[PDB]
């Protein structure tokens, strides 16, 4: 009848719920525990950095590059036209999401001297090698051969995007606040 079949549905429906209630916590325990910080904030002293020096700093378990760019680095970055870039988005947390990847939109200052970005290859997360490496006067990722230029923009290789720029701002003349 109609009252007979209702038991076999209600029982099976309850059984289905019980499996789901047990499986979700077995998955969610692998999600970040309460001791894990998603975002944080720190301050970096930069007065000792001459042009041509890259400072590498740990932030959320990953490297952040703070390079005081030379004259050559700045000139090369500005000479690249937007249409010659793999990724034309600035990837800059400090400005609008739709901003273009011009060298001006890749630095913290108007002079374009301070390049602050995640030293995390956008391919699969290795640390690109700086010191003017690669074929575009920037960084070379030794893991699968991505080349970034002097503004940290991806130019060659498997990596899909420019190295991201975190929230970063000078709190005073000589100190950058990340986050």
């Amino acid at each position: 009848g109609t009252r007979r079949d209702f038991l076999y549905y209600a029982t099976a429906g309850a059984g289905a719920v019980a499996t789901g209630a047990a499986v979700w916590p077995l998955i969610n325990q692998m999600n970040p525990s309460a001791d894990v910080q998603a975002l944080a904030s720190i301050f970096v002293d930069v007065s000792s950095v001459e042009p041509g020096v890259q400072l590498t700093v740990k932030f959320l378990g990953k490297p952040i590059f703070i390079r005081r760019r030379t004259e050559a680095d700045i000139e090369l970055g500005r000479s690249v036209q937007l249409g010659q870039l793999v990724d034309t988005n600035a990837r800059n947390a400090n400005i609008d999401a739709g901003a273009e990847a011009t060298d001006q939109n890749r630095t913290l200052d108007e002079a374009g001297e301070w390049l602050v970005m995640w030293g995390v290859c956008t391919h699969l997360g290795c640390v690109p090698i700086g010191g003017v490496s690669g074929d575009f006067g920037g960084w070379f990722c030794p893991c699968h051969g991505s080349h970034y230029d002097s503004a940290g923009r991806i130019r060659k290789g498997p990596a899909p995007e420019n190295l991201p720029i975190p929230l970063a701002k000078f709190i005073d003349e000589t100190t950058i606040q990340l986050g």
Binding site: L7, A14, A34, Q37, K58
Partner: protein
Amino acid sequence: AGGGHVEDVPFSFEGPFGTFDQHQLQRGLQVYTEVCAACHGMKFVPIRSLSEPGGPELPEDQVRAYATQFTVTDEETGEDREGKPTDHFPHSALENAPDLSLMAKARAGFHGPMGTGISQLFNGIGGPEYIYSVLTGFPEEPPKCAEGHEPDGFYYNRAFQNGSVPDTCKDANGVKTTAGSWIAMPPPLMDDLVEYADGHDASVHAMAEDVSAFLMWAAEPKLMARKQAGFTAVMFLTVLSVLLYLTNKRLWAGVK
């Protein structure tokens, strides 16, 4: 040593539907910082957990301000700095002062009868009740049996059972006569030693009950989450058991 009698306090968190009183935990937190923290640490409690739901639930800015007072040795730097919410409470400053992170679970106040465990089954383990009894059990005069035989640096406590006892306080078989024994902790509380912000009375009774609730939360911060899960599982399985009972019956019907 042995077990003893504890005062059966009615804490809000007791019973299957029992829950923490948020303001009480904050008062207890104030007591710990202003009194207990001089000697006792909580090396397993992250300071940030004061914000988590089901506890004192302080705004994250207050907790950030609270963490500053602690001097933590930074792991990478190795140099000292102000505390953050991500730091744990410090270790015990006093070497023989036990850590209080898990005290409310590492002590049982209810035992027996005749070692059948029935007492714990109905009254709970009784850890926060025990803490209350120790904070309460400091008399101004010691028991008459040790009038002038007190070990120096120790203090008689009614509820403490693991301490030494003078020879004059034992019977012919060597068992202690006193309800309690001598503890190395001097009486930490005294009326209105703490000035509660909400004007709650700060008698030894209130502070002892308040700090016991805080110490219960520090030991079992997920108590409320644990019970919600218990209720859900029991209600699920009650319904499921009924459905499975009728199902089992209607199946075996075609046999008998």
